[PDB]
């Protein structure tokens, strides 16, 4: 049943970058809460020695999406991206951060 190892709450973008920069695996990721836009989420993802960020977009129905596919929950958006690329330019699949 366990809590998700990917939800970091309100941490600055820069701290997300610092933390993901230390991770060894492409796709290592977290979800954080925006410091600028109340109630909004962002997804930060290790790729090489870069950290890609994606904005979690909302529609009028309160779905969560990145691109076109609409999700009922952050949990469903995250899990879908474990096996479909979060990136349009590169194959990047999300994988849980390592606590090391």
From Swiss-Prot:
GO terms for biological process: actin cytoskeleton organization; B cell receptor signaling pathway; branching involved in labyrinthine layer morphogenesis; cellular response to ionizing radiation; endodermal cell differentiation; epidermal growth factor receptor signaling pathway; fibroblast growth factor receptor signaling pathway; insulin receptor signaling pathway. Ubiquitinated by RNF173, leading to proteasomal degradation and inhibition of the RAF/MEK/ERK pathway. In the nucleus, polyubiquitinated by RBBP6 at Lys-55 at DNA damage sites. One of its GO terms (cellular component) is nucleoplasm. There is a cross-link at residue 55 (Glycyl lysine isopeptide (Lys-Gly) (interchain with G-Cter in ubiquitin)). Residues 6-98 form the SH2 domain. One of its GO terms (molecular function) is identical protein binding. Keywords: Acetylation, Cytoplasm, Endosome, Golgi apparatus, Host-virus interaction, Isopeptide bond, Nucleus, Phosphoprotein, Repeat, SH2 domain, SH3 domain, Ubl conjugation. It is found in: Nucleus; Cytoplasm; Endosome; Golgi apparatus. The modification N6-acetyllysine is found at residue 55. Changing residue 36 to N: No effect on the interaction with SOS1. The keyword Iron-sulfur does not apply. Changing residue 35 to K: No effect on the interaction with SOS1. Its main location: nucleus. Homodimer. Associates (via SH2 domain) with activated EGF and PDGF receptors (tyrosine phosphorylated). Interacts with PDGFRA (tyrosine phosphorylated); the interaction may be indirect. Also associates to other cellular Tyr-phosphorylated proteins such as SIT1, IRS1, IRS2, IRS4, SHC and LNK; probably via the concerted action of both its SH2 and SH3 domains. It also seems to interact with RAS in the signaling pathway leading to DNA synthesis. Interacts with SOS1. Forms a complex with MUC1 and SOS1, through interaction of the SH3 domains with SOS1 and the SH2 domain with phosphorylated MUC1. (Microbial infection) Interacts (via SH3 domain) with hepatitis E virus/HEV ORF3 protein. The SH3 domains mediate interaction with RALGPS1 and SHB. Non-enzymatic adapter protein that plays a pivotal role in precisely regulated signaling cascades from cell surface receptors to cellular responses, including signaling transduction and gene expression. Thus, participates in many biological processes including regulation of innate and adaptive immunity, autophagy, DNA repair or necroptosis. Controls signaling complexes at the T-cell antigen receptor to facilitate the activation, differentiation, and function of T-cells. This is Growth factor receptor-bound protein 2. It comes from Homo sapiens (Human).
């Amino acid at each position: 049943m366990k809590p998700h190892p990917w939800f970091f709450g309100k941490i600055p973008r820069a701290k997300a970058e610092e933390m993901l920069s230390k991770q060894r695996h492409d796709g290592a990721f977290l979800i954080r809460e925006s410091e600028s836009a109340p109630g909004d989420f962002s997804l930060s993802v290790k790729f090489g020695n870069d950290v890609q960020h994606f904005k979690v977009l909302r529609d009028g129905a309160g779905k969560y999406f990145l691109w076109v596919v609409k999700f009922n929950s952050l949990n469903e958006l995250v899990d879908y991206h474990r096996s479909t690329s979060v990136s349009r330019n590169q194959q990047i699949f999300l994988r849980d951060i390592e606590q090391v």
